[PDB]
C-alpha cells in the first residue's frame, strides 16, 4: 500500500553511490570521528549534563543527611 514508487514526487535530483567493494568500511575513522564526536558533545552537553549533575548532588546530600540522621545527638 505504501511501498516504493508512490511515496513522494521528487524532480531533478541526482544521486551517486559506489559499490561497497570499491570503498573502505572505515574510511578515515578517528580523524573524522573524534572531531565529530567532540562536535556532537559540544552541541548537546549543556542540555544533557546539568540535570544529571544536580541529581548527583542531591544523591550525595541525601546520603550524608541519612548518615547524619543515624548519628547520635549528644
Amino acid at each position: 500500500g505504501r511501498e516504493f514508487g508512490n511515496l513522494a514526487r521528487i524532480r531533478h535530483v541526482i544521486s551517486y553511490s559506489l559499490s561497497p567493494f570499491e570503498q573502505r568500511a572505515f574510511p578515515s575513522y578517528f580523524s573524522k570521528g573524534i572531531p565529530n564526536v567532540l562536535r556532537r558533545t559540544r552541541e548537546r552537553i549543556l542540555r544533557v549534563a546539568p540535570p544529571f549533575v544536580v541529581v548527583y548532588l542531591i544523591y550525595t546530600w541525601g546520603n550524608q543527611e541519612f548518615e547524619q540522621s543515624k548519628r547520635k545527638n549528644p
Binding site: 511515496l7 513522494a8 521528487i10 542540555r47 544533557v48 540535570p51 541529581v55 540522621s69
Partner: protein
C-alpha cells in the same frame, strides 16, 4: 513469478521486513523496540525451559527452584538468564518509551495506545513472575501490593479476596499466578503484532521529525544488519550480566524461603517498579496513592493531547529538551527514592520529585512549546 510478492505467507514478511520503506537517518535508538521483541522471544524460550521443572506448590516452589539451579544441567544459566533478561527487557522498554517521548512519536495515537497496554501487560507479567520463586521478598511484595490494591472502598476487599483466592497469599495465589504469568506473554506477542500493524499502516518516524518520504531505503539489508548488531550488543550486556554479576539487580532476601511469621525490615520490589513505589509513598493516602500509581503510568497515554507545538521532534526545541532531561533526571531520583527507607529526608525529596514529575509532564512542557512557537514568530 517470484514467491516474495506472490505467496501469501511470504507477502506479509516481504511487506513487513524485506521491502518495507524505512527512513535512512534513524539512529541506534530505533533498534530498541526490535530488541524488545527479541527480548520477549528470549524470555518465552527461557520461560519454557523453566516451566519444565518448576512445581507450583508452596511446599515445593523454592525447592524446585534450587533443583533447577543445582541439579538440572545448566539450569542456573536458564534461570539467571530469565531474570537478567527481564531486567534488560525493562531497560529496552524504558529507552523505547523515552525515545517515543523525545522524538514526538506519540502522534501515532493507536500505536501509542497499544504500546501503553503492552506496558501494563509486561509490568503485570514481571510482578507475577517475581511472585513465582516464593522467596521472602516475593511473598511479602505480593502481600504488600495486593493489600494496598485493596484501598478502593466497598469493592477493594472482595476484589483482593478474589485475587488472593483466600484471606492472604497462599497456594491458590501461587498456582493462579503461575497460570497468569504463563498466559500473559502470548497476549503480549499478539498485541505486539497489532502494534507493528498499526505502525506499518502509517510508516515510522525519523529523528528530525520531517517527512522521510523524500529519502527512504529498503529495510533489508540495512536495518537487518543494524538489528543484528544491536542484538549482538544486547546479548553482550545480557551475558556479562548473567555470567559475571548475577546479583547486582537482584535481592539477597529472596534466597530465603517464604515465612508468613517473619516480616523483613525493608520490603521493596524491583527497580523498574521502584519509582512508581516512590510515588506510592509520596501521598499519605491509600486511594490517593493507588490513583497516583495508575495516573503515573497513564499520563504517557494522555500525552498525545498535550502537544501544543507545530514542530514534531525535540531536535529543534532546546528548552523542551532541557525540561525533558530534567524529567529523566527526576525519574532517576524517584527510582533511587523508591528503594530507600521511609525516613527523613527521603519523604520531602520523594514528594518534591513526584510534584516535579507531574508538573513537568502536565504543566511546563506545553507552556515551553507555546513560548518556543512564540519565539519562532509562529504563535500570535
Amino acid at each position: 513469478t517470484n514467491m516474495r510478492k506472490t505467496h501469501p505467507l511470504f507477502k506479509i514478511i516481504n511487506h513487513s521486513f524485506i521491502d518495507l520503506p524505512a527512513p535512512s537517518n534513524i539512529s541506534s535508538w530505533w533498534n530498541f523496540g526490535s530488541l524488545l521483541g527479541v527480548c520477549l522471544m528470549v524470555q518465552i524460550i527461557t520461560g519454557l525451559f523453566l516451566a519444565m521443572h518448576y512445581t507450583s506448590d508452596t511446599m515445593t516452589a523454592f525447592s524446585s527452584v534450587t533443583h533447577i539451579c543445582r541439579d538440572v544441567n545448566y539450569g542456573w544459566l536458564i534461570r539467571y538468564m530469565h531474570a537478567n533478561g527481564a531486567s534488560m527487557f525493562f531497560i529496552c522498554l524504558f529507552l523505547h518509551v523515552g525515545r517515543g517521548l523525545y522524538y514526538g512519536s506519540y502522534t501515532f495515537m493507536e500505536t501509542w495506545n497499544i504500546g501503553v497496554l503492552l506496558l501494563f501487560a509486561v509490568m503485570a507479567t514481571a510482578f507475577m513472575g517475581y511472585v513465582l520463586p516464593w522467596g521472602q521478598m516475593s511473598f511479602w511484595g505480593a502481600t504488600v501490593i495486593t493489600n494496598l490494591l485493596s484501598a478502593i472502598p466497598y469493592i477493594g476487599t472482595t476484589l483482593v479476596e478474589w485475587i488472593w483466592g483466600g484471606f492472604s497469599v497462599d497456594k491458590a495465589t501461587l498456582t493462579r499466578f503461575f497460570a497468569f504469568h504463563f498466559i500473559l506473554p502470548f497476549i503480549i506477542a499478539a498485541l505486539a503484532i497489532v502494534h507493528l500493524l498499526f505502525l506499518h499502516e502509517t510508516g515510522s518516524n525519523n529523528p528530525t521529525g520531517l517527512n522521510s518520504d523524500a529519502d527512504k531505503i529498503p529495510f533489508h539489508p540495512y536495518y537487518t544488519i543494524k538489528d543484528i548488531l544491536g542484538i549482538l550488543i544486547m546479548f553482550l550486556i545480557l551475558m556479562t550480566l548473567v555470567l559475571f554479576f548475577p546479583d547486582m539487580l537482584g535481592d539477597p532476601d529472596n534466597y530465603m524461603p517464604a515465612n508468613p511469621l517473619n516480616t523483613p525490615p525493608h520490603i521493596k520490589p524491583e527497580w523498574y517498579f521502584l519509582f512508581a513505589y516512590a510515588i506510592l509513598r509520596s501521598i499519605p493516602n491509600k486511594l490517593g496513592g493507588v490513583l497516583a500509581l495508575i495516573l503515573s503510568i497513564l499520563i504517557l497515554a494522555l500525552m498525545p493531547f498535550l502537544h501544543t507545538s507545530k514542530q514534531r521532534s525535540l531536535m529543534f526545541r532546546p528548552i523542551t529538551q532541557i525540561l525533558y532531561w530534567i524529567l529523566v533526571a527526576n525519574l532517576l531520583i524517584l527510582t533511587w527514592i523508591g528503594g530507600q527507607p521511609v525516613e527523613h529526608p527521603f519523604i520531602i525529596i520523594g514528594q518534591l520529585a513526584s510534584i516535579s514529575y507531574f508538573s513537568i509532564i502536565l504543566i511546563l512542557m506545553p507552556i515551553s512549546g507555546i513560548i518556543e512557537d512564540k519565539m519562532l514568530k509562529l504563535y500570535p
